[PDB]
Write a protein that binds this DNA or RNA. Structure first.
Ligand SMILES: [Zn+2]
Ligand SMILES: [Zn+2]
Ligand SMILES: [Zn+2]
Lengths: 1181, 370, 114
RNA sequence: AAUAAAGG
């Protein structure tokens, strides 16, 4: 009796961790390779349109990247990336220029239990270093085994392992390792400390750290020591290799700065003055400086200077003052600027600097000069929304009054993002809600065109209809112009603008006519054997296609339309075509003109104009292959557009039977043919239930892009960065006609038909940004946000936040406060103060003067929206906001707490209509560590007991307690049950009885496990418990009394596992859209992604399991990793699919789909039914 | 001198070593730190009284758990030498068994007397908890094994050996256990019935330690016998898998590590030995430095290479596996011999019960002390 | 997540069926034990099957004052103790240290001073 | 009630 489920990645993670600057694509330009957990982004630095970074490529892995390096091999024409994955995996990959993807050059597994020396748990991450002269690489695996990989003058050789502790001067506890600059042989400088100590034991032992220079001879596997030093300060943190011609290392310790070299006494300098009685090293004070160098990032921006990002944000510029022979004499600090909490840092082109951050938005900065001072300027920022510490689910404020009266609810996710000076609230929605400015009722009409007439504001709304048409004047008020030069007599097949909007062309199934306002200039009748059915305008060309397959071209020569017949004599009937006015520079063999044509015999072709010359052909087009290549199923539509900055990135959209296909053009290179190929793009758009379904707009709110109409409508947007954004819009129904619009009521807006015969003139709600994986609004708090709680009846957000101050006192046993008194150069402690704010979803600005400050040293350990019984509401319950507080003085003070029940009320004021009503605030006889509700009671966790309180007449009244585990830190209830979570024991299932007033332990997981959070997998008449652990694993346990190993029911049996690959700290869950009482269970990971588990049937689970095995064994994967060993724990039960792999079936041609479904036995229609139904069921937010 | 709990003593501000501030600090560091490569270093200064995380907060430094700071000494009023000390599974409190057969229950936060019970009719020698935290199992001198519940109630008392039982341990499923005796045999028992499955008759005399394995079915024993000091057993079968000639004196204790790869043993020839449980032909390493015998050993419950030991002279030393020389220690911790050690389930307090009639509490050091 | 969006009230669970019927339950292996157990429903409605050795808490008598050892979790007379195992601070015993002398040393004294 | 006060 198990529970099956799919996993899905509802939002890719955002926080970046590594950055590098290398020749990724080729040896012409260099560009920025940044990484994340399981993600890789190659950005191209622009200098126009004002610097911005254009996303050039993006890849994802079945493995969390643990390190990254670059190398320039022997005969290669680009740099190879050496990536490092879990416990030992060194994978060397490269760029594939003929397919625009990432090829795996080699894969190295160094995972054998002989290498662990006994220890089962691994705490020593892989660390990959590369020699500056690209002559070898090193990888420190398991904290002991130094793997050496030479490169050839196949550019690879047999790697070999070294016992780093077998060397003379046995190494232990390695801190960090580097290669030096300026040696005839490669040389690894290792910083370690043989005799380890603790900041509580520096009185007993110090001067522990040492360094060694291991000169690696790769030709005959010899590696002696050349120089070592000992007794260095106990808390050395980092090593920095100093480029030539200075040439040494710079070693950071928490309180000092050291420079080391050959034949040079260690030049050390103490920065703050906590080096008193903790080092016997000779440290000379640094005068006008008082800082600490832990958790600091550093990079050299010249041979002499370097930049340092401290633990708090401040950016300094260190200069290595030298003698006449570049022997570092003294140092110089200089506080340049302040910035974000970096997590990496790299120097780009001279003048630029990328500060990578997983705690806030990554920043590209610029530095100019003015012995030198550098000022910094934020040039650009990459959005980040992690770590997602907590998440509330609240409803948006305004919804256009037509979109109400709808069954599906309208929801919104507020998330506690960032840390420190960078703590914000991220508001996320998934769809788009068009702000409906006005509505009409025009039944009968089935198509429209919005054309500019006489500064690019739209004139006539050329509508269309069955037998006749209709035209609206639309300058100030939407008024039906009648009796005009246009053709109202028949059904219009096209309408546009030619000659920089100076003209109009209305194409009808009898001829074409060109206009100049209301009056027509010219009309030429078109008869060729068949009626017109297709028309495509690229200024100054017009190409019209017939209902049978003839083609004819027009242009505007100096003033009406001129006839021309294209010499495309061929034996295959034509089905579709389009024109393309290229402003970019990619289509070569400055604007040019291109005609993309599709025939009946499968083929596709691309002609240049006006000559109608062949430059590119594809044999088997409608199948949907993955790279379109120049060769020497009912295709319904085809559209080729240029997007990005200044029309830089061309895509090809295709509507084939029930399928959407998206290609992006990339360059490549018979002879005399188009130098372009077309790589397929993955997506999740569903076309399942002669007018165009693709609608190009530019500047609908400031954005260029396309609208994909149909049963599942979508917005395809691209911005200054070439990041493609695919946003749903299904609040209205299935859209079936669209038009970009610009008036005095809808300035930079749009208008569209739905399928109830209604026009809607609308604009984009101008408070979210649409250049993000989801539409997001960031809200900076300048502090740290811990807990967020949407209070319902008030529609407000209660937010518990903190801020750091210096520290002055020290508590004692009768609670003396021994005041701290040090010299001037003393780095004070840090001390948090909490505040509980209100935030309004209307302006997303904090309500003025409704803020609860809390007593000094009083941390808040929890804040929830609990619904407690009361004789004032209909449903007998009502929601409050409760927060439990721990007053943590120190280790030697009996930690107490306090419970704080607030309400949010309505008062006579704009924003000041809401205030806190502190209904209860009282000290409890122990720490308060988590709380929830259970049928109207406040379930509090005080110390090591769990109490169930009743708030009557505004005073808490005990009713039951129970004795529990070490430290409860999470509790979640459902329907009389409670589920407690502990910090070293896994979980316990509890219960309450209104009648006898008795808690009771239903059962428990007797094994040990370090939980982060816990929730419920709700299924039809079943209930699992979803747990996430310290090891990035989700796990579903159940209560099965008749299971013969759930003995008396007194155990929880792990009925499913899954290795998500990321820490999850918060869950929530929503119903569906076979799915009767199944709930989707969502969560947010501490890396900035969103995910979901969906409960399934077994019948479907087995089919999709067969498919999953076939996909993982029959396809190649990026960097060779396999998606089976990546979803394993650390006994294993694995009743959970992958979801991120099943969607790869959607990315296969129909030939390959048929092959694989036959090698399983099933039918690709049934496969796609399962997959796409799982997709449409989880379409929320 | 009677102490019935009715004497009206004035208040006392008890010397406390609390863990809740440190745990709260750790829960707040989780959300914005990957691991200890994202940790801002604690300073050795007296004002950083809030920047301490528990042993789980840092796994790149086991040195923190070297508890050489005295806290509190817990002596009864009618003194007896202490034989075995065990934290209840949730760290709620601490239990001491002494040579009078009494259980003395001490608090685990302020360390004060809570209660006392007359448990055995004989010096209590063995005390251990099941892996599910439900059953406590005790053994006295020259006699019985008794079953205890979490509230310290006695549900079943059963004669096992005609002579003194020295140690015990549970099966990973807690359904069957072992007892080694002064009769030179190891008897393997069923639990729900008090039924004896096997008798193990390999030793020469006075099996004085036994221990099951966390996953496998192999039971280790250790004796006075200079000819077969350490032996292996298969419980269902009852056959000596191997024999281990490691110590030439009565091997006091024997400990299998939770990763299932390591054995550690301690003997009256001043030494402790770590053995790789699969390759028994050699000695994985020899922990030297004890001016007299070694009598008690205990692995740390969070860190995998850290353990503590105490000898016949009052010393208690702290050792780490990959490390050669002694890591830390306290020379005159007691006056008599340390009989039993116990780490706190969380790993920050160490209790040591000795032959000088007391039991002392040790904790981690404070930043920037004297 | 909220009681408005995802409302599991119209549903019955496997738990709620295997809890109020005591489905997986074996009798006690030793006589005399049961704090942290269900107040037996069958014994309330006079249908207790396990016969005195029921694995869940029997409530035979009526009791008046809170059990002094139960508050610390050390009561051995469970299911047969003379004193309530209920957390009702209005039915707590009287302070010895106040009733005899006249000055309690516990600032947070849970015992009824009077 | 079976040590609530076990800093005697
Ligand atoms: Zn009953
Ligand atoms: Zn009782
Ligand atoms: Zn009192």
């Amino acid at each position: 009796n198990a529970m099956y489920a799919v996993y899905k990645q509802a939002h890719p993670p955002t926080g970046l961790e590594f950055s590098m600057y290398c020749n990724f694509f080729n040896n012409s330009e260099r560009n920025l390779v940044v990484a994340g957990t399981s993600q890789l982004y190659v950005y191209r630095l622009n200098r126009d349109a004002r610097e911005k970074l254009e996303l050039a490529a993006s890849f994802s892995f079945f493995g969390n990247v643990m390190s990254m390096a670059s190398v320039q091999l022997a005969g290669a024409k680009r740099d190879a990336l050496l990536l490092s994955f879990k416990d030992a995996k060194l994978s060397v990959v490269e760029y594939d220029p003929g397919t625009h993807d990432l090829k795996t050059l080699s894969l190295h597994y160094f995972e054998e239990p002989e290498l662990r020396d006994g220890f089962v748990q691994n705490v020593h991450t892989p660390r990959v270093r590369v020699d500056p002269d690209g002559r070898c690489a090193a990888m420190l695996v398991y904290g002991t085994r130094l793997v050496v990989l030479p490169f050839r003058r196949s550019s690879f050789l047999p790697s070999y392992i070294i016992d780093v502790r077998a060397l003379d001067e046995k190494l232990l506890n390695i801190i960090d390792l580097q290669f030096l600059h300026g040696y005839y042989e490669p040389t690894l400088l290792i910083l370690f400390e043989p005799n380890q100590t603790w900041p509580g034991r520096v009185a007993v032992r110090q001067d522990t750290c040492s360094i060694v220079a291991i000169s690696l001879n790769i030709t005959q596997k010899v590696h002696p020591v050349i120089w070592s030093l000992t007794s260095l300060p106990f808390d050395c943190t980092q090593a920095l290799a100093v480029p030539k011609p200075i040439g040494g290392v710079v070693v950071f310790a928490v309180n000092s700065l050291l420079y080391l070299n050959q034949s040079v006494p260690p030049y050390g300098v103490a920065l703050n003055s906590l080096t008193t009685g903790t080092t016997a090293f000779p440290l000379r004070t640094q005068e006008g400086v008082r800082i600490t160098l832990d958790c600091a990032q550093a990079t050299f921006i010249s041979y002499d200077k370097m930049v340092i990002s401290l633990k708090g944000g401040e950016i300094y510029v260190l200069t290595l003052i030298t003698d006449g022979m570049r022997s570092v004499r003294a140092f110089h600090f200089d506080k340049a600027a302040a910035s974000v909490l970096t997590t990496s840092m790299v120097t780009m082109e001279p003048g630029y600097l990328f500060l990578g951050s997983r705690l806030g938005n990554s920043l590209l900065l610029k530095y100019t000069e003015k012995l030198a001072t550098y000022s910094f300027e934020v040039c650009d920022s990459i959005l980040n929304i992690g770590p997602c510490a907590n998440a509330a689910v609240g409803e948006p404020a305004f919804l256009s009054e037509e979109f109400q009266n709808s069954p599906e609810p309208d929801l919104e996710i507020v998330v506690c993002s960032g840390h420190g000076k960078n703590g914000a609230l991220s508001v996320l929605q998934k769809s788009i809600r068009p702000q409906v400015v006005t509505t009409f009722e025009l039944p009968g009409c089935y198509d429209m065109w919005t054309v500019i007439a006489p500064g690019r504001r739209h004139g006539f709304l050329i509508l269309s209809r069955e037998d006749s048409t209709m035209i609206l004047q639309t300058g100030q008020e939407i008024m039906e112009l009648d009796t005009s030069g246009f053709a109202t007599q028949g059904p219009t097949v096209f309408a546009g603008n030619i000659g920089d909007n100076r003209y109009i062309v209305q194409v009808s199934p009898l001829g074409i006519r060109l206009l100049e306002g209301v009056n027509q200039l010219h009309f030429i009748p078109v008869d060729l054997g068949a009626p017109i059915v297709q028309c495509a305008v690229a200024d100054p060309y017009v190409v019209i296609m017939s209902a049978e397959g003839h083609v004819t071209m027009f242009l505007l020569k100096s003033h009406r339309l001129a006839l021309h017949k294209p010499p495309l004599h061929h034996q295959s009937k034509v089905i579709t075509l389009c024109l393309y006015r290229d402003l970019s520079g990619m289509f070569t063999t400055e604007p040019t003109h291109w005609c993309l044509l599709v025939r009946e015999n499968g083929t596709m072709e691309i002609y240049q104009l006006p000559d109608w010359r062949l430059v590119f052909l594809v044999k088997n087009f409608p199948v949907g292959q993955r790279v379109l290549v120049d060769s020497s199923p009912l295709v319904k539509e085809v559209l080729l557009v240029a997007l990005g900055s200044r029309q830089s990135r061309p895509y090809l959209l295709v509507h084939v039977d029930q399928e959407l296909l998206i290609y992006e053009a990339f360059p490549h290179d018979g002879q005399g043919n188009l130098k372009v190929r077309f790589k397929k793009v993955p997506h999740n758009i569903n076309f399942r239930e002669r007018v165009a379904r693709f609608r190009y707009f530019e500047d609908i709110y400031g954005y260029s892009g396309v609208f994909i109409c149909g049963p599942s409508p979508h917005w395809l947007l691209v911005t200054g960065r070439g990041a493609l954004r695919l946003h749903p819009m299904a609040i209205d129904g299935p859209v079936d006609s669209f038009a970009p619009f610009h008036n005095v009521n809808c300035p930079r807006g749009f208008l569209y038909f739905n399928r109830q015969g209604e026009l809607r003139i609308s604009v984009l709600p101008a408070y979210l940004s649409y250049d993000a994986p989801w539409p997001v609004r960031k809200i900076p708090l300048r502090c740290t946000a811990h807990y967020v709680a949407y209070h319902v009846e008030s529609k407000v957000y209660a937010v518990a936040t903190s801020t750091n101050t210096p520290c002055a006192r020290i508590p004692r046993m009768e609670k003396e406060f021994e005041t701290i008194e040090r010299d001037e150069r003393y780095i004070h402690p840090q001390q948090e103060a909490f505040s509980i704010q209100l935030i309004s979803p209307v302006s997303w600005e904090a309500i003025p003067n409704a803020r609860i400050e809390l007593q000094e040293w009083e941390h808040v350990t929890c804040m929830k929206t609990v619904s407690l019984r009361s004789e004032e509401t209909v449903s007998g319950l009502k929601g409050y906001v409760a927060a439990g507080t721990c007053l943590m003085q120190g280790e030697e003070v009996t930690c107490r707490g306090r419970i704080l029940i607030m309400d949010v009320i309505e008062v006579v004021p704009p924003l000041t209509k809401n205030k806190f009503k502190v209904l209860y605030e009282k000290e409890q006889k122990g720490p308060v560590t988590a709380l929830c509700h259970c049928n109207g009671h406040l379930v509090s966790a005080i110390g090591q007991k769990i109490f169930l309180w009743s708030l009557r007449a505004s005073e808490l009244t005990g009713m039951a307690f129970i004795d529990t585990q070490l430290y409860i830190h999470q509790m979640i209830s459902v329907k009389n049950f409670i589920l407690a979570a502990d910090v070293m024991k896994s979980i316990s299932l509890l219960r309450y009885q209104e009648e006898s007033k008795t808690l009771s332990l239903v059962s428990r997981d007797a094994k040990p496990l370090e939980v982060y959070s816990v929730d419920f997998m709700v299924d039809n008449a079943q209930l699992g418990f979803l747990v996430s652990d310290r090891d990035r694993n989700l796990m579903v346990y159940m209560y099965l009394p008749e299971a013969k190993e759930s003995f008396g029911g007194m155990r929880l049996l792990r009925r499913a596992d899954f290795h998500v690959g990321a820490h999850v700290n918060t869950f929530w869950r929503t119903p569906c859209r076979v799915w009767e009482n199944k709930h989707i269970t969502w969560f947010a990971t501490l890396d900035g992604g969103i995910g979901l588990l969906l409960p399934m049937q077994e019948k479907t689970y087995r089919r999709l399991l067969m498919l999953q095995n076939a996909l993982t064994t029959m396809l190649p994967h990026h960097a060779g990793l396999n998606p089976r060993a990546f979803r394993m724990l650390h006994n294993a039960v694995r009743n959970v699919l992958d979801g991120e792999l099943l969607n790869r079936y959607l990315y296969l041609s129909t030939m390959e789909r048929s092959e694989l479904a036959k090698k399983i036995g099933t039918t690709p229609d049934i496969i796609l039914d399962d997959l796409l139904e799982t997709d449409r069921v989880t379409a929320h937010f | 001198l009677t102490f019935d709990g009715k004497r009206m003593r004035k208040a006392v501000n008890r010397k406390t070593i609390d863990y809740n501030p440190s745990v709260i600090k750790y829960l707040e560091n989780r959300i914005w730190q990957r691991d200890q490569r994202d940790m801002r270093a604690i300073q050795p200064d007296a004002g950083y009284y809030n920047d301490l995380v528990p042993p789980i907060g840092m796994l790149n430094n086991p040195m923190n758990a070297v508890t050489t700071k005295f806290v509190r000494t817990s002596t009864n009023k009618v003194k007896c030498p202490v034989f075995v000390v065990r934290w209840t599974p949730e760290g709620r409190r601490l239990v001491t068994g002494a040579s009078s057969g009494e259980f003395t229950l001490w608090n685990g936060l302020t360390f004060n007397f809570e209660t006392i019970l007359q448990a055995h009719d004989s010096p209590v020698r063995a005390m251990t908890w099941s892996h599910n935290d439900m059953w406590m199992l005790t053994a006295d001198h020259g006699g019985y094994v008794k079953y205890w519940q979490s509230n310290m109630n006695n549900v079943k008392m059963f004669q096992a050996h005609k002579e003194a039982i020295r140690e015990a341990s549970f099966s990973p499923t807690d359904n069957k256990f072992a007892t080694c005796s002064d009769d030179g045999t190891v008897r393997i028992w069923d639990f729900l019935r008090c039924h004896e499955e096997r008798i193990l008759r390999g030793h020469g005399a006075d099996v004085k330690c036994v221990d099951w394995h966390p996953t496998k079915g192999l039971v280790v024993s250790g004796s006075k016998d200079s000819q077969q000091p350490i032996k292996f057993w298969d419980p269902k079968t009852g056959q000596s898998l191997a024999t281990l000639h490691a110590h030439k004196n009565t091997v006091m204790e024997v400990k299998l590590n939770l990763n299932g790869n390591w054995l550690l043993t301690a003997s009256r020839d001043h030494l402790c030995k770590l053995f790789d449980i699969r390759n028994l032909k050699e000695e994985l390493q020899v922990f030297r430095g004890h001016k007299k015998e070694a009598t008690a050993v205990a692995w740390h419950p969070v860190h995998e290479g850290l353990f503590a030991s105490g000898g016949s002279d009052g010393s208690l030393l702290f050792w780490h596996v990959g490390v050669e020389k002694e890591v830390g220690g306290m020379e005159m911790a007691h006056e008599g011999m340390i009989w039993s050690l116990a780490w706190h389930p969380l790993g920050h307090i160490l209790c040591s019960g000795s032959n000088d009639h007391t039991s002392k509490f040790w904790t981690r050091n404070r930043p920037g002390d004297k | 997540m909220q009681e408005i969006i995802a409302s599991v009230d119209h549903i019955k669970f496997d738990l709620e069926i295997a809890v109020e019927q005591q489905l997986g339950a074996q009798p006690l292996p030793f006589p005399g034990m049961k704090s942290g157990a269900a107040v037996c429903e069958f014994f309330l409605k006079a249908a207790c099957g396990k016969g005195g050795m029921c694995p869940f808490r029997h409530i035979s008598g009526e009791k008046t004052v809170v059990c002094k050892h139960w508050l610390r979790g050390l009561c051995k007379k469970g299911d047969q103790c003379e004193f309530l195992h209920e957390y009702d601070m209005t039915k707590m015993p009287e302070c010895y240290f106040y009733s005899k002398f006249g000055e309690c040393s516990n600032k947070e004294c849970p015992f009824l001073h009077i």
